[PDB]
């Protein structure tokens, strides 16, 4: 009951309840390197929800790529987690999901969006703490951002997610 409590407070500090989430990844160069080196290929973000008692979700990013994007792109996925109120929610999950890599000059962001594949186990009511993540393996070319550009500034980047609430 020492570090465990901190982890809980940090995740609480990062929670949102309106389907909009902004994830700030610091120490970028290092994490990027640990991915490239295969020691830590992916990282989960803290959890957020569609409403106060809505769906519990988080994101997972591979700084050096997953699947078709391995070694060439930054891969970004959506994760449906086991929420405290899943018994009261409608399943499978079927809300539009938008993902973004924010340009820090706010000129041109990187973006993609999709409607859930309702047949996929990724969107069924969770039995485990988290379902299999799904989203965009070719989200962003490692070259574009990372290198020059204004996506990485003061060794950090901002990832943004927007879960459409139509019907909720």
């Amino acid at each position: 009951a020492m570090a465990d409590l901190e982890q809980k407070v940090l995740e609480m500090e990062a929670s949102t309840y309106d389907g909009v989430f902004i994830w700030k990844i610091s120490d970028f160069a290092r994490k990027r390197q640990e991915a490239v080196a295969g020691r830590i290929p992916a990282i989960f973000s803290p959890a957020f929800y569609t409403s106060r008692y809505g769906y519990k979700m988080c994101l997972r990013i591979y700084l050096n790529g997953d699947g078709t994007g391995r070694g060439t792109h930054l891969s970004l996925f959506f994760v449906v987690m086991k929420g405290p109120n899943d018994a009261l929610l409608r399943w499978p999950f079927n809300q539009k999901v938008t993902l973004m890599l924010l340009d820090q000059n706010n000129r041109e962001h990187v973006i993609d969006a999709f409607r859930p594949d309702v047949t996929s186990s990724s969107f069924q009511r969770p039995v485990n703490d988290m379902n299999i993540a799904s989203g965009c393996p070719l989200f962003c070319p490692v070259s574009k951002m990372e290198a020059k550009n204004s996506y990485v500034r003061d060794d950090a980047i901002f990832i943004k997610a927007i879960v459409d609430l139509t019907g909720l």
């Binding site: 992916a42 999901v97 594949d117 996929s120 990724s122 799904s134």
Partner: peptide
Amino acid sequence: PVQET
């Protein structure tokens, strides 16, 4: 969407 690997 495409599932993670």
